[PDB]
Each structure stands twice: as C-alpha cells, then as structure tokens.
Amino acid sequence: TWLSDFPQAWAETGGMGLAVRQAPLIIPLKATSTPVSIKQYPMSQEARLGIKPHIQRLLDQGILVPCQSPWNTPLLPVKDYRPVQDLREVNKRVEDIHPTVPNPYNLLSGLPPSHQWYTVLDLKDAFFCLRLHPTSQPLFAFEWRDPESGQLTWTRLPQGFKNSPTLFDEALHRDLADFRIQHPDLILLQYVDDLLLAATSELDCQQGTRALLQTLGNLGYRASAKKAQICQKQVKYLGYLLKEGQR
DNA sequence: CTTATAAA
DNA sequence: TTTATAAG
DSSP, X not given: OHHHHOTTTBXXXXXXXOOTXXXXXXXXXXXXXXXXXXXXXXXXXXXXXXXXXXXXXXXXXXXXXXXXXXXXXXXXXXXXXXXXXXXXXXXXXXXXXOOOSOOHHHHHTXXXXXXXXXXXXXXXXXXXXXXXXXXXXXXXXXEEOOOOOEEEEESBOOTTOTTHHHHHHHHHHHHHHHHHHHOTTSEEEEETTEEEEEESSHHHHHHHHHHHHHHHHHHTOOBOTTTOEEEESEEEETTEEEETTBO
16 A cells, blocks of 8 residues: 555654754844734634634644744634634745745646656645744744633744745755655656656656655655545646646 | 735 | 725
8 A cells, every 4th residue: 555655654644744854944034124013803712712723733743832922913813713824914024035936837847748657745734844943933923812821933834924835845855856866767846845756657656656755754744645646647736637748 | 804906 | 986806
C-alpha cells in the first residue's frame, strides 16, 4: 500500500509536520513600522464555542502559545466555525518581498509531452510546517478568552500573512533541490503546497513517487493521502485536467 | 466584522 | 452615491 509503505509521508499517519531543515523565519518590518493593537470585536458564544476546539488543538500542538504582545489583530466573529485572523494591519507593516511563485499557467508550460504519467500531492497544513523565529512571533498575536483573558500567538508561519505562500514555496524549493538533482529525468512542479511529479513511464512514476514521499516525510512535510493522485495518466492539478499532455 | 475595489 | 463583491 502507498499508505503503509510511507507512514511518515502522509498527514493521516505521520503526525503534524515540521520542516526540520528550515531555520525559524525572521519577518522583517518596514523601516517605519511600529506595533498596532487592534481591539477584538466581541465574539458571540456560538462563534467562540465553534472556534474553541481548533484553538485547543493548536495549543496542544504547540502551534499556538500564550504571549503578551504590543501587536494584536482580530479573529473574525462570524468566520462550521474555524478561526480566521485579519492580518491586514500587520501585512501593511511588513517589508515586501519579491513574488517568486509562478502563476499556474507559466508553471504548467514546463510540462513536456514526453512525461505523461502523473502523481499529484498536496501538503497538509503546509505553512504550519515552517517555524517562526521567536522574535517574529509577537507580530501575529490575537486575543483569546474562555470565561468558564489573554493573547495567543503563532509559532509557525500563519494563515492570512501576505508572505506565507512565497516563503513556503521558497522553503520547499530549498528542501527539494537535492531530490531534483537525484532524479534528473523526473519533472517536478511546485505551486506552494500543490505538487505535480511527471514521468516518462508508469514504472518511473512509481519509483519517483516513492522517492518523493520518502523525501517529503524525512524533511518533515506531510501529504494528504485522501486526496493523493498516484501514478495516473489523468490528474487534476491547479484546476486543470491533465490528460494526454493537454492543458 | 472590517475594508478594498468594482459595479450598479 | 449606493450597492455588491471579495477577502483577511
């Protein structure tokens, strides 16, 4: 089984990821920025009870930690509840970086007709695999209370932060550089957390996929076994249907 | 909820 | 000028 053969590589069996080779990220501020503390709009009990289990899981996982910070941004009061942080005022104060993630159209142009056997993997909770340096953690604080009050913040690259997709894409590229060198006859397309591996034959695709899963797992990333498309001549990738070299 | 942009 | 849409 693809599952049993690579327990470490799958989110379902390997536990929450952590990119062990990647240094905790420091997030540079713009030259003139100072902290902004935005009050939390009062949240209804219904919303709070909805969000609570997610917050607790993240705390248990060490992805959230208590803190006291001069920064504060709101969680959405209406957000099937899940916590969404409005990081816009933080984003405005963070120094911009060059956008290096290719658009899907251009990314797909690197797929040759010679390689028509596909594996598509998506990494689960990808941003959370990247640690934030403790110096940058306070930037992302928000308020949490459970009547029956303090701030929490993220110890990993957060959702809603303007640079997360680019920083993740760049980190995974660094981590997969050797894989590319070891497998010169495979095509690997990276779009943040969405990966396409393409091979000349079913066999090469099988061996390539084994090697990619082993590598991802070893590095601390986790792919979704449920959504995995393995060694197919027809796959869905980035909203396209990849079929016989078309699209 | 707030806010940026677009469409009406 | 208002309304709608989208997104953190």
